[PDB]
Design a protein around this ligand. Structure first.
Ligand SMILES: Nc1nc2c(ncn2[C@@H]2O[C@H](COP(=O)(O)OP(=O)(O)OP(=O)(O)O)[C@@H](O)[C@H]2O)c(=O)[nH]1
Ligand SMILES: Nc1nc2c(ncn2[C@@H]2O[C@H](COP(=O)(O)OP(=O)(O)OP(=O)(O)O)[C@@H](O)[C@H]2O)c(=O)[nH]1
Lengths: 438, 50, 99, 438
């Protein structure tokens, strides 16, 4: 009907998945045991859960997700959480060996003998489903293992199906922070392998997330609980269109068909304006005009790219909760009149607006307050070229000194890909300025 | 099944609540069926034997 | 108290005791808990002259769990769900050194 | 009416007889003491139990089975176990000396002076029998005793009764696991002596049962408590149609007429789809579509033969529980249209569906599930000739060197029969080849 399959590959995807499904169960009112209260919504798998959970004759809402993990520690922990009876046993595919930060170790030595099992899972989901709109793949680029095995699974799913969308989130490598030094290598390898197969790859950065945290959450020492909670609420917002109803509606297929301009370039950015705390929402007040202004304030976006150093071309606004369309269209018109912003010629129309009436929900004991109006903002602009500029004048030095290539070649790799990736990236940036200019 | 179609545009396949079936069904040597034993009536009962 | 002790007015350019230790959450709850600690230690050193495991629950655990709890392999021939659940009780009787 | 006679020849037959009978007594509530308290299911000895019991003037359900063995050890342990009081006293025929893995030891030295007693017992059962559909005989090829004795009994009952039915189930020796280097000898002897009287014989493998047990049932240290209860479930599944009623039914005569294409070749394979443990049944989903897909999954089978190395000519569905014809036909049509299966052009249809409403039943201290939808798989293919090539080349070198032949010549064997065996096998070989040819 209207459903998507969730895949989480990794170290990098386990905690965010934990948070997001906790929010899902909380908001639909699932008890972490799995069933409903005396209210009558258990059925033939067709009610609001029919999009996310496979509640079957057993009466338990079963998530339609698979986690695959190379290092069994964290997956044992997640099974030793509380929602274990909720989750499906062999949808929790665990291994015994890490990919050890090596792109080619992940992609070649260990991955191939796991793709059979993961394919078996996904096909036994593909038989039961009927709508199969697409997948939600969670991984990273600064991942020790979320890189290579993820690339391989992407390749197999692309070659078997080219008839469904492919949505990717990513915690992007930090621009100036690098926990790993194999980060640039395996990251660019992932990028150049995935460019010709990815439908919509989106990014977000931990440093800017923290910057928001101590800016307006009034949290100078947040945590993962908080970071993952924020990202989970973001994805909840983007799936609200599927779950609830509304006046005018858009779908992820519309997202793809209406945000990417050309071939190749499909990496936009996202934001959520009303990030405030209990007392803040208490004796303050939000409204459409200032949520627009805040969501387009240059710092509020979660990547360090200055819009005045770039030029806008596409924007999709998702408002959720109560709102009238008058102020919406009026405020976006005023922003059109704004003189600090920059629109390229190609897009006299560039605003895809989508409304859902249902208010966003809170998590108990968490940080975010009650929300009356909320917005997810998805913008694409030329600005992000500087990040790849950074990555290339980083990687060039390591290649000049042929650093750390011994590991990869000893486990059996050759210069070909290492050379190719640099001009793949170079083609990417050159296209960036070619389209940015007029 | 007519009521099943009395729901919306598309059908949905309801079924019997399996909870009752587990908590009430003969397993092991423990039966769960009870048995009553009586005589048929007519105007003048003849095969009262069975 | 005066105004509020549960909270100390956001953006408090003044400081508080109990900066280290329990920390890493939102602000107001930290304020409450920290001042609770500040009167706990207070009366504790006051003490005037005194001399004068959800990892396992009821029905065992999911398949494919790793980590050796005592035994298993020494005993066998049962469904792993059972095996785990029966170990859940015999970890009180013979391998009772599990706590 | 609808009643059958069971023969349990050998060390192995008699135990799985005990296990399956311990099954049988439960689903009709028969107690380990063999008498119910005051309630009534008794009558003219004529009701659902009458298929396998005949509760006579003493209100005791009497098995319609016979147990013949050579070594008195296990017949003693079952004469001292929990069910000796219900088992009929002198039916349980015991010997004093083994068969020593020699075919001619059971076929020339011991079996002669016991066949009289056993035939007398089966005739004084056949008199009280009325319908007498047939005989469920359990032997084993690599039987440490039973092969030779079973050959003699089967051939004599075939020649004296050439109108009733004969069905053979037997644990088949493994492709690579060995308990007897002598196993090829008696295997080929029994084959070339039985292929011209056996109506249909069905082979399964202990390793395969084990592999299932630790892939899905999650049994890392099974025994055949577990696996015998599985095979008992299999036979109960094939006989549920006999026992109960329903929409449309199936019979062993239909099996005889419609599974086997030609004389000689009467060797299908058996499977049970929804093998599943407690928690998987509890909080997952089952339905006709996925259970059919699973039962046609190529690794679920009990003998290692690759269907892409084979080709199908017959299939029998035994759908038990709550299943309905519409989804039955939809699933089978989808399976037909799927291209992995490669049916021969002989039979444009290759399917025989059978229905029963009564769900299968669990057993205390067991592994099976509260399954509402079960399906027994009985399919005949062409993948199996690889195994007979396997056996003949496993045999040829060892005969060419003639190991242990001194034993057989000492007990009174010659070599004409051993010679004849391999051209019988090659006959079956070229027969499978030719029927495959098209
Ligand atoms: N995606 C994600 N990344 C995080 C999180 N916390 C820190 N990180 C960053 O994400 C990276 C995780 O990458 P990896 O450690 O290579 O993950 P992996 O390749 O799947 O496998 P491992 O190295 O064994 O854990 C780290 O380098 C961190 O810098 C988080 O919650 N989620
Ligand atoms: N049916 C049954 N099979 C068993 C039992 N224990 C072991 N087996 C199986 O029995 C098969 C071998 O039987 P045989 O060794 O030929 O036994 P036999 O020739 O009848 O006579 P024995 O000397 O008593 O063993 C093996 O494939 C085992 O899987 C049991 O209790 N019951």
């Amino acid at each position: 009907m209207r459903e998507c399959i969730s895949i989480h590959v990794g170290q990098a995807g386990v905690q965010i998945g934990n948070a997001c499904w906790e929010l899902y169960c909380l908001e639909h009112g699932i008890q972490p045991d799995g069933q409903m209260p005396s209210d009558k919504t258990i059925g033939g798998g067709d009610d609001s859960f029919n999009t996310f959970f496979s509640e079957t004759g057993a009466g338990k809402h079963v998530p339609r997700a698979v986690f695959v993990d190379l290092e069994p520690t964290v997956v044992d922990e997640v099974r030793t959480g509380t929602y274990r009876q909720l989750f499906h046993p062999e949808q929790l595919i665990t291994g015994k060996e890490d990919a050890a930060n090596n792109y080619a170790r992940g992609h070649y030595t260990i991955g191939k003998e796991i793709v059979d099992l993961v394919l078996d899972r996904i096909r036994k989901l593909a038989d039961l489903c009927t709508g199969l709109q697409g997948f939600l793949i969670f991984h990273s680029f600064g991942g020790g293992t979320g890189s290579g095995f993820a690339s391989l699974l992407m390749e197999r799913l692309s070659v078997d199906y080219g008839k469904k969308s492919k949505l990717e989130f990513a915690i992007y490598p930090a621009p100036q922070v690098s926990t790993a030094v194999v980060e640039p290598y395996n990251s660019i390898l992932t990028t150049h392998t995935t460019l010709e197969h990815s439908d919509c790859a989106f990014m977000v950065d931990n440093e800017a997330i923290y910057d928001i945290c101590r800016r307006n959450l009034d949290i100078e020492r947040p945590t993962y609980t908080n970071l993952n909670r924020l990202i989970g609420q973001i994805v909840s917002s983007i799936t609200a269109s599927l779950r609830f109803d509304g006046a005018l509606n858009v779908d992820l297929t519309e997202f793809q068909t209406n945000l990417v301009p050309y071939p190749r370039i499909h990496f936009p950015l996202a934001t959520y304006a009303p990030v405030i705390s209990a007392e803040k929402a208490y004796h303050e007040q939000l409204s459409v005009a200032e949520i627009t202004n805040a969501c387009f304030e240059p710092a509020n976006q979660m990547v360090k790219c200055d819009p005045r150093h770039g030029k806008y071309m596409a924007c999709c606004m998702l408002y959720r909760g109560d709102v009238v369309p008058k102020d919406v269209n009026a405020a976006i018109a005023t922003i059109k009149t704004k003189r600090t912003i920059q629109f390229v010629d190609w897009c006299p129309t560039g605003f895809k607006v989508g409304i859902n009436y249902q208010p966003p929900t809170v998590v108990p004991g968490g940080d975010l307050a009650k929300v009356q109006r909320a917005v997810c903002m998805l913008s694409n602009t030329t600005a992000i070229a500087e990040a790849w500029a950074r990555l290339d004048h980083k990687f060039d030095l390591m290649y000049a000194k042929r650093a750390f290539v011994h590991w990869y070649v000893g486990e059996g790799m050759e210069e070909g890909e290492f050379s190719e990736a640099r001009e793949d990236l170079a083609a990417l940036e050159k296209d960036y300025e070619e389209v940015g200019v007029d | 099944d007519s009521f099943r179609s009395c729901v919306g545009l598309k059908p949905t396949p309801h079924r019997k609540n399996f909870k009752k079936f587990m908590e009430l069904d003969s397993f092991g040597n423990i039966s769960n069926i009870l048995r009553y034993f009586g005589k048929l009536i007519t105007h003048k009962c003849a095969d009262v034997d069975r | 108290p005066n105004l509020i002790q549960r909270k100390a007015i956001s953006g408090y350019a003044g400081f508080v005791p109990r900066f280290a230790w329990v920390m890493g959450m939102n602000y107001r709850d930290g304020v409450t808990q920290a001042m609770d600690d500040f009167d706990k230690n207070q009366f504790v050193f006051r003490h005037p002259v005194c001399a004068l495991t959800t990892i396992y629950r009821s029905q065992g655990l999911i398949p494919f769990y790793m980590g050796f709890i005592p035994s298993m392999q020494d005993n066998y021939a049962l469904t792993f769900g059972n095996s785990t659940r029966r170990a859940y009780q015999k970890e009180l009787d013979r391998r009772s050194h599990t706590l």
